[PDB]
Every structure is written in structure tokens, then in C-alpha cells.
Amino acid sequence: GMTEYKLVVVGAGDVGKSALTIQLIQNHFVDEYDPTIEDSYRKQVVIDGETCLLDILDTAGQEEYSAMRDQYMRTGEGFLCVFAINNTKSFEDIHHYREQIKRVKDSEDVPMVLVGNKCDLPSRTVDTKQAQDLARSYGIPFIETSAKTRQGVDDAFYTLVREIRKHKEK
Ligand SMILES: Nc1nc2c(ncn2[C@@H]2O[C@H](COP(=O)(O)OP(=O)(O)NP(=O)(O)O)[C@@H](O)[C@H]2O)c(=O)[nH]1
Ligand SMILES: [Mg+2]
Ligand SMILES: [Mg+2]
Ligand SMILES: [Mg+2]
Ligand SMILES: [Mg+2]
């Protein structure tokens, strides 16, 4: 009888989709190869005093899996749209992910958070102002994260749940 939220993590290869999810679930970062390409996780959390169960779908982002993207997305209630701040192509891809989500959910109003990951790095190619303005143009929150240091990780997922809760009031 507990409220469940279905989250889907999307973004280009190597942006840190899995690392962010593993930090949320296991509270660690380990840079090691893992051959799985489709993983569902369940985590019970308390957000604003309300307990819920997150079902988090984390799939590999390489283009060779692109035919499955819409089918994974179609299961989601909310989307963590991740790019890496040192990967300009991953930021350019965000527009196409947003368009695909809108198409799959048949709506211009879909719970979504833009995540700029790898903020621990000493260099970056994507300016924070550019990402903030993009998020504003979509009407979604923007959060900078590091799966390595854990900065912003809880805030990214919890903000997404808050976005779903607000959407369900409509
Ligand atoms: N410095 C730093 N490295 C990170 C961060 N997040 C992930 N990485 C590293 O970047 C690489 C890709 O991370 P991974 O979580 O596998 O990314 P993914 O988005 O799930 N890739 P795929 O689409 O192939 O499943 C790994 O070497 C990982 O350790 C971060 O916040 N900071
Ligand atoms: Mg990979
Ligand atoms: Mg992954
Ligand atoms: Mg640093
Ligand atoms: Mg909005």
C-alpha cells in the first residue's frame, strides 16, 4: 500500500547514470566495468516526511540500444535527464531526449530534472548558465551533481519525486 514512483534515468553513454544510481542505493562510487545494460532498483526513501518506494530504471546509453529507448521511457513517471559537464555532445543530446520523452508520454508537461554530472572535475565544457537557461526553457529544475563526491545526488532524485508529486496534483 506504499506509494511507488517509477523513475527512468536517461542520457548519453558514460555521463554517470549508473554511478548516480549506485550512489543513491549503495552510497559508494567504484570505477569498475559492469556488463549489465538494464537494471531496475527499488529504494525506500523519505521525502518531505512522506515515505515512498522508488523504482529506478537504469539502462545503458549507447546508440546501439536506441531502439529500446522509447520502450524503457514509456514505463516512467519521471525522468532524470543526465549530461556530463565535460561532454558537450551529451549536453547537445538533451534536446533530443526531451523531445523523445514528450513524444512517448504524449505531453509537453512531464516530470523531469536536468542533471549536470561530474561536477568534481577540474575542467568542464558546458557552462552552468547554459544548462540553467535550457532547464528554464523546458520548465524543469537543474541540479549539478557528482557521483564521486555524492554532491547533489539525493537532491536530484528527491527533486524529481517532488516534480512527480506536483504533476499528480493536476
Ligand atoms: N569524476 C567523475 N567520474 C564519474 C562520475 N560519474 C561517473 N563517473 C565515471 O564515468 C564513467 C561512466 O560512468 P557510468 O556510471 O558507467 O555512466 P553511464 O551513464 O551509466 N554509462 P552507460 O550509458 O554506458 O551505462 C565511469 O568511469 C565512472 O566512474 C562523476 O560524478 N565524477
Ligand atoms: Mg557503459
Ligand atoms: Mg550505466
Ligand atoms: Mg575536483
Ligand atoms: Mg515544468
Side-chain angles (χ1 to χ4, degrees), residues 1-49 51-62 64-128 130-168 170:
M2 187 186 299
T3 293
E4 190 164 12
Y5 298 112
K6 276 163 93 223
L7 315 185
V8 180
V9 186
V10 307
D14 309 308
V15 299
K17 298 181 297 297
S18 299
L20 285 167
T21 301
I22 290 161
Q23 267 288 13
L24 187 78
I25 306 293
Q26 292 301 326
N27 295 71
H28 65 221
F29 176 88
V30 180
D31 188 0
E32 65 184 349
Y33 170 69
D34 185 340
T36 59
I37 60 163
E38 175 202 285
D39 294 298
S40 291
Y41 300 91
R42 303 276 261 267
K43 190 190 184 64
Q44 190 185 298
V45 299
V46 55
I47 300 171
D48 304 330
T51 300
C52 59
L53 190 66
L54 309 184
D55 184 313
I56 304 163
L57 179 60
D58 173 44
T59 64
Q62 286 73 39
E64 68 192 76
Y65 309 117
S66 71
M68 300 184 296
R69 286 173 186 176
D70 67 290
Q71 303 164 53
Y72 288 135
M73 284 170 173
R74 195 170 283 112
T75 70
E77 289 174 278
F79 301 85
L80 214 65
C81 292
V82 187
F83 69 97
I85 69 175
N86 66 329
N87 182 347
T88 295
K89 187 256 186 202
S90 77
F91 181 67
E92 297 168 355
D93 285 349
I94 293 293
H95 171 80
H96 299 305
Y97 287 115
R98 163 120 183 129
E99 291 291 311
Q100 181 168 41
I101 292 160
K102 289 189 304 179
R103 184 173 47 75
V104 169
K105 306 307 288 183
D106 199 35
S107 183
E108 307 195 332
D109 192 347
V110 181
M112 184 175 306
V113 172
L114 182 63
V115 175
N117 191 45
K118 309 198 180 184
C119 73
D120 54 280
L121 290 175
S123 71
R124 65 190 287 163
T125 59
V126 181
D127 202 272
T128 176
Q130 254 182 70
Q132 282 175 323
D133 195 60
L134 185 65
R136 178 209 51 76
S137 81
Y138 298 157
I140 69 177
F142 169 58
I143 293 167
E144 287 197 352
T145 60
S146 170
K148 180 183 275 289
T149 69
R150 213 165 193 275
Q151 178 160 44
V153 172
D154 282 346
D155 190 30
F157 284 97
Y158 292 7
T159 296
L160 182 54
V161 171
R162 290 186 188 105
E163 291 299 299
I164 295 166
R165 284 168 176 175
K166 292 199 300 196
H167 183 74
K168 294 164 73 212
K170 301 164 184 174

PDB file of all heavy atoms in Angstrom, residues 16-19 36 58-61, ligand 3:
ATOM      1  N   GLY A  16      27.322   9.077 -16.337  1.00  0.00           N
ATOM      2  CA  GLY A  16      27.216   8.741 -14.941  1.00  0.00           C
ATOM      3  C   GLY A  16      25.835   8.328 -14.472  1.00  0.00           C
ATOM      4  O   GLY A  16      25.560   8.431 -13.275  1.00  0.00           O
ATOM      5  N   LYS A  17      24.961   7.866 -15.375  1.00  0.00           N
ATOM      6  CA  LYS A  17      23.633   7.405 -14.979  1.00  0.00           C
ATOM      7  C   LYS A  17      23.726   6.328 -13.908  1.00  0.00           C
ATOM      8  O   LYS A  17      23.057   6.395 -12.871  1.00  0.00           O
ATOM      9  CB  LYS A  17      22.912   6.853 -16.206  1.00  0.00           C
ATOM     10  CG  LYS A  17      22.690   7.884 -17.294  1.00  0.00           C
ATOM     11  CD  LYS A  17      21.946   7.316 -18.508  1.00  0.00           C
ATOM     12  CE  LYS A  17      22.721   6.210 -19.228  1.00  0.00           C
ATOM     13  NZ  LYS A  17      24.021   6.665 -19.819  1.00  0.00           N
ATOM     14  N   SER A  18      24.553   5.309 -14.155  1.00  0.00           N
ATOM     15  CA  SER A  18      24.680   4.218 -13.199  1.00  0.00           C
ATOM     16  C   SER A  18      25.372   4.672 -11.929  1.00  0.00           C
ATOM     17  O   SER A  18      24.967   4.283 -10.829  1.00  0.00           O
ATOM     18  CB  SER A  18      25.441   3.054 -13.821  1.00  0.00           C
ATOM     19  OG  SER A  18      24.758   2.556 -14.960  1.00  0.00           O
ATOM     20  N   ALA A  19      26.417   5.496 -12.055  1.00  0.00           N
ATOM     21  CA  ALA A  19      27.141   5.932 -10.864  1.00  0.00           C
ATOM     22  C   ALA A  19      26.232   6.732  -9.935  1.00  0.00           C
ATOM     23  O   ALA A  19      26.307   6.603  -8.703  1.00  0.00           O
ATOM     24  CB  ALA A  19      28.366   6.755 -11.259  1.00  0.00           C
ATOM     25  N   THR A  36      26.247  -5.380 -17.138  1.00  0.00           N
ATOM     26  CA  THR A  36      24.800  -5.266 -17.249  1.00  0.00           C
ATOM     27  C   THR A  36      24.418  -3.978 -17.974  1.00  0.00           C
ATOM     28  O   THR A  36      25.084  -2.945 -17.847  1.00  0.00           O
ATOM     29  CB  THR A  36      24.147  -5.319 -15.869  1.00  0.00           C
ATOM     30  OG1 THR A  36      24.645  -4.249 -15.058  1.00  0.00           O
ATOM     31  CG2 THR A  36      24.451  -6.654 -15.194  1.00  0.00           C
ATOM     32  N   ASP A  58      17.663   1.985 -14.835  1.00  0.00           N
ATOM     33  CA  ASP A  58      18.972   2.458 -15.270  1.00  0.00           C
ATOM     34  C   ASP A  58      19.436   1.554 -16.405  1.00  0.00           C
ATOM     35  O   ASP A  58      19.708   0.368 -16.189  1.00  0.00           O
ATOM     36  CB  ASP A  58      19.963   2.397 -14.103  1.00  0.00           C
ATOM     37  CG  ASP A  58      21.380   2.710 -14.526  1.00  0.00           C
ATOM     38  OD1 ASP A  58      21.556   3.675 -15.298  1.00  0.00           O
ATOM     39  OD2 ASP A  58      22.314   1.996 -14.082  1.00  0.00           O
ATOM     40  N   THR A  59      19.549   2.108 -17.607  1.00  0.00           N
ATOM     41  CA  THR A  59      19.916   1.339 -18.786  1.00  0.00           C
ATOM     42  C   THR A  59      21.094   1.998 -19.489  1.00  0.00           C
ATOM     43  O   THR A  59      21.333   3.203 -19.349  1.00  0.00           O
ATOM     44  CB  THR A  59      18.729   1.207 -19.752  1.00  0.00           C
ATOM     45  OG1 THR A  59      18.367   2.503 -20.245  1.00  0.00           O
ATOM     46  CG2 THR A  59      17.508   0.580 -19.060  1.00  0.00           C
ATOM     47  N   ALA A  60      21.829   1.198 -20.252  1.00  0.00           N
ATOM     48  CA  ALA A  60      22.990   1.725 -20.953  1.00  0.00           C
ATOM     49  C   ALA A  60      22.569   2.698 -22.049  1.00  0.00           C
ATOM     50  O   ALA A  60      21.565   2.488 -22.737  1.00  0.00           O
ATOM     51  CB  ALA A  60      23.795   0.576 -21.556  1.00  0.00           C
ATOM     52  N   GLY A  61      23.373   3.741 -22.249  1.00  0.00           N
ATOM     53  CA  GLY A  61      23.008   4.839 -23.119  1.00  0.00           C
ATOM     54  C   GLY A  61      23.584   4.834 -24.516  1.00  0.00           C
ATOM     55  O   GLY A  61      23.304   5.763 -25.282  1.00  0.00           O
TER      56      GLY A  61
HETATM   57 MG    MG B   3      25.246   2.691 -16.967  1.00  0.00          MG
END
